[PDB]
């Protein structure tokens, strides 16, 4: 058995633009970077408070072939994304949530968090 971590992705608007605030299972604001110390999953739940109809479309990586995250799954309503991390390859990867919105046809990118694997 591995570990299942749960993070909430709160999105508000400030000055007409999205602001992403992550909270942990204790309701604490967390900066977003995570250390993974055994195989497991990371589950992100969207709490969209923007009124802009945000939905997750996926998780974006500048280095998608680095093997730090094995897979991304997404729910049919775009309210959840989950990362599979088997924590074999040690190292670090950065990713950004990619979201659609109902106001326009541009995708929305969150700013940057990091996954650190320690096998």
From TrEMBL:
Give binding positions for Ca(2+) 2: 67-68, 70, 85, 87
Keywords carried by this UniProt record: Calcium, Metal-binding, Zinc
Write out the residues that bind Mg(2+).
Answer: 67, 70, 87, 89
Q: Give binding positions for Zn(2+).
A: 67, 70, 87, 89
**Any GO molecular function:** metal ion binding
- Give the source species: Shewanella oneidensis (strain ATCC 700550 / JCM 31522 / CIP 106686 / LMG 19005 / NCIMB 14063 / MR-1)
Q: Which residues bind Ca(2+) 1?
A: 13-14
InterPro entries in UniProt: Cupredoxin (IPR008972), DP-EP (IPR015078)
Provide the protein name: Autocatalytic aspartic peptidase
Coiled coil residues, start to end: none
């Amino acid at each position: 058995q591995g570990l299942a971590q749960f993070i909430k992705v709160n999105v508000t608007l400030e000055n007409g633009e999205p602001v992403f605030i992550y909270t942990d299972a204790n309701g604490q604001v967390c900066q977003g970077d995570i250390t993974v110390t055994q195989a497991g999953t990371i589950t992100y739940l969207l709490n969209d408070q923007t009124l802009k109809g945000l939905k997750f479309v996926g998780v974006g990586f500048v280095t998608p072939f680095d093997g730090i995250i094995d897979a991304v799954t997404i729910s049919s309503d775009g309210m959840l994304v989950q990362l599979v991390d088997l924590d074999k390859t040690p190292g670090t990867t950065k990713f950004q949530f990619v979201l659609s919105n109902t106001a326009n046809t541009l995708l929305v990118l969150a700013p940057d968090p990091q996954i650190i694997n320690r096998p």
